[model samples]
Target: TCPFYKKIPGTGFTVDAFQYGVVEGCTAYFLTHFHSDHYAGLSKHFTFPVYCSEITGNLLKNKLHVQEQYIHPLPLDTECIVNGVKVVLLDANHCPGAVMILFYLPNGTVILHTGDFRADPSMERSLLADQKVHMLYLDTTYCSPEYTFPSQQEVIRFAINTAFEAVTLNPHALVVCGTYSIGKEKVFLAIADVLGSKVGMSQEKYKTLQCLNIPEINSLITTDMCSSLVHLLPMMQINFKGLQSHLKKCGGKYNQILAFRPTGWTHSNKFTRIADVIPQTKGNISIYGIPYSEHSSYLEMKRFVQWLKPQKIIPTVNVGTWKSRSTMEKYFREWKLEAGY
Candidate 1:
């Protein structure tokens, strides 16, 4: 029996009843990433055999603290069959655990779902060389033409320069900046490179960086260096006055106190308000908003569809007619006339 799909209210997308409901025949579901929007209703209701890259699974378990038994981890660039469907996980180059899924159907159709990917040329070369895709569910988060980002190397340089400027401005103050714990380990590395010191990160963030095998920048402060630098100061450890007290106690007398927050901190209601009120002790606090997004941009989405050259393309993760959809259709229509779709 074919499963019924229903449009999830407010999201403008269909929720597969076989997966969400108590149906025995339903076998598999794919979680593209651990972001809230993509996996909002998953943990509580859907307990089917979930497929994602091993890194993605580790992220869900360690970062998000999810302990569901149904999740099945697959290595990168490997194809596996679950519930009679062939699925392949590709390196997305978005987040540390991000993946793009390609589903090969029995009807000779190929569906590519780019789950929050960036248009890294290295990634494109890898995908094109390995797979011949058809229908693509593109990540159009930055689908508007206005969005653009500086190169990752350039972003790192700027962040390092900014950190130096902060130290110069406030010779005896604390500096805190926010970045995504997973993808922006480069930022922390850059800071350590410039300051000759490592800024502590949360346990979850540190684990993510370790998993990626990012090289440590310094060895001056070894296992027996400052005990405080080895561990992150708990959020509770530094309250309003506690922040000032801790800075003084740490002998942040000559050198400035450098701190980092996960990228989610800026968007979170709980943290956003507090971030605004955090007073600069003797140093100016610099908030950097570089383009460290894991999703693909408008142009990348367009190019993916152009390459696929599918007869019909349907976007998942979002509903309604997107400008991305129009742009994709425009290209496909032109191609169809030439190739006879």
Candidate 2:
């Protein structure tokens, strides 16, 4: 569901508000990342200017083929003026080119809008620690205690080691990773590196990665399906049916397939360890759902909010319905109590 408060109250700028359709008085458009959910409304049919990180701007230009004249690629950690508002972009740590926006208004209202972020301790070292945030537009994707999964690095290592062990036993096994157009690179990239195999993807996705201009990643990726046993596929195509089609496309070079479907939803505290999460195997294909998430966990959100000490917190996700938002508000009040407000 689209967020109700995509439009900032005091500014004419809309953050990730493309689906709302030409919001009245929306003089500027700000994109947090290239994720489909955030960019669903963006196209060539805009009269206002769009602002985002350099990598996101490139993706918009190359992947979406949007007009160049309207896109403004801003540098990270640098302050600039958009009309009268002072703006800064910080790494969101969610995906390539994803950033959390900091808007310092003329009236001294400091607003931090996190597009979709995996909160880290490194953020405390930024100016975020120094400022008293008036309002925080938060990514409350997993804003519950039940979502306390392992860290991203631990999950990546788990995917890498588990896949490595399976592939080593069956030397001809193909390892396919479930990923989006721009997220979950670390999982597949680490798996390929440990296996010493190249990553195979479609030419279109390869060109999209090219927009990032990261040399090591470019060197590790291959467009040829037959060259690499480890391949990256869209998350939707991780099922057995999709795996069967992929096997036929690859000419049966590999005897079996081990697919890692990494996402936060597949995880739950019921499993003590990430390795305890089970895999489903049907004939020649086995799919493991990894707890690799890009958004902040409940604990992470708690620490971030306490650290920022914002006057008020606004939920950017899971706020479409009263039922969901009402539940979230209960959590928010608890956080406020913890913050000693």
Candidate 3:
């Protein structure tokens, strides 16, 4: 029998299914990361034992107020046994505390659950290089060919260079970039480093940064609105009115506002070159939607699936309906066959 999206097929363990009431017969719950979408159902009402990365465990305890007794913080790149199943955590390269979970069941079956990741070359030499992944629970967020984009390094460089050049030309312009609670910290932090300026963030955001063990980060964040010309805000506030309202609240401390909302939505096959990506401007506000995706691109996914050669590939995202699942399934079948598997 096919299990629901959250349940691990052959095990009593459930991954990120806090809102499903109590999944009968499930003993352990695993959270891939702290993203709202993945941790949506997680709440204080649960009684099951929850497992996640150390950083994610902290976020859950501090942010969501989940009880410490039920939370287990696992070490990365190491294996531990839970109910006789060997479990290991690999850096997903997605968010601060995100991980790709590896479950080695008793029957010599290897299950790789990618909890939202940006597939990188480093993973080529990963521990899984020698092992055959029997079942792959993949993050298919950008599984389609239409979702192609450049590597993360190039996009970060572009953002840093674009902002540095723009700020150099207009010294008084304030640069604001969108950030989630856990993701996209590198872009804004690197921008501030190159600009030699402090970052303006809310008290909650600054506290959230504590979960990440960044050294000497206290000097990088500031609460005073006008103290820093570079600011990072929630993605919701990166829009025109949001930026305008924030700029106005600062009492004209900045002459103009330059904002960047980095996500994969700005990417496509049409924009072959990252330099060709443009920004939308209206009066004092200019917004650049950079192709800064955390999920694997279409080509990256193809390369990953081919390299891993999992006996079964399960789409974790875009599986809401049969039509969408079939669309992703077509890609999986086509890519798997192209690899001569």
Candidate 4:
């Protein structure tokens, strides 16, 4: 029954000639995504060949700055042999270049590892069609039954409505929200789609968008393209004095200036600092709380796990003894019995 082995904390398990010792009898290691948690020990312990999707390889190379010697690329939906194990990578939908990995053992044992993923039915169907997975390593970050998340479209709508409201309330003031470049790009695209105009992008975001090769939606101007929009910069690059200067220059002319907020600000003390910098030209600067999460909700995670019906479900990131752990364990017990694990 112990076809797999768990390693001691921080150190890899010992086996044979394999670099990390975990792949002695095992054929290859399948990296599900480029998240730091999933591949934390990679640089320190990984010396043998690993398999991941081409996008993942590129992301690790270009974004994560990992070396190329450790990765062996595989195309999406295509099966490839690593050492002797059959491996497949599927789109995860959490990030632009994330992937979920599937491993098919020679002994007919099958495993699916869901990296940090949102509730994406299309991605779920795509992975389910490839094989009957016996075991699943689930991403249950928000799997607690009490947790709830709004849909992506709803979140986008909230952002748009908030932006419009802010602009209408103060025609001459500027608004700045914060989000990561990738997620903020989606928000901006949604805004452009609704407003029939493109939002200005910072140099950093423009470079990222250019590399992504996304189709042109609206004729959006970059800051470099327009001097007026240059006032809108990524939250990370702006200082308090700089922000004050921009607000003073644009005050009373525009109702609101739209700015993207950075992730993790909610958990950090910087939220107060950011609020203090809002333009005082209007009655009050509005801060919108749009529930846009890249991770799946409790219900979505349950539905995904129930559909897969894997024999044994293992959790990867955010696996701890609390609501998340309890929920995952409950699902694993129920599904494992039902799937005849």
Poorly placed runs, candidate 1 (over 4 Å): 1-25, 42-47, 63-69, 165-175, 179-181, 204-283, 317-341
Against the true structure, candidate 4 reaches a TM-score of 0.70
Ordered list by TM-score, greatest first: 2, 3, 4, 1
Q: Which runs in model 2 stand beyond 4 Å of their true positions?
A: 1-4
Q: What would the TM-scores of all predictions be?
A: 0.67, 0.95, 0.94, 0.70
lDDT digits (tens) for residues 1-341 of candidate 3? 22476677668987767766777889898999998978887777656798999999888888888899989999998979988889998999998889999999888899999989988878979788868899999898887777877777888888889889989998989999898768878888888998998898888988798777677988887887678888878899888889888888878667888888877655254555887767889888899888777888888888888989889987888888898898998888898889888
- Model 3 misplaced stretches (Cα beyond 4 Å): 1-3, 267-269
lDDT of 2 by residue, 1-341 (tens): 43457878788888998887667788999999999988997777665799999999999888777899989999998888998889999999999999999999777788889999999989999868777888889899998888787888888878888888998899889999887668878888899999998899988888988898677776799998788878988889999999999888877588899998876665355556876777898998999877777888889988888777788889999887899889888988888888786
Better of 1 and 4 by TM-score: 4
Evaluate model 3: give its lDDT.
0.84
TM-score of 3: 0.94
Encode model 4's per-residue lDDT on 251-276: one tens digit a residue. Answer: 44554445544342233332333223
Q: Candidate 4: deviation at residue 168, Å?
A: 5.4
Clashes found in each candidate (C-alpha, N, C closer than 3 A): 1, 0, 0, 17
Error of 4 at 70 (Å): 5.3
Ten residues in a row with the worst lDDT in model 3?
Answer: 263-272
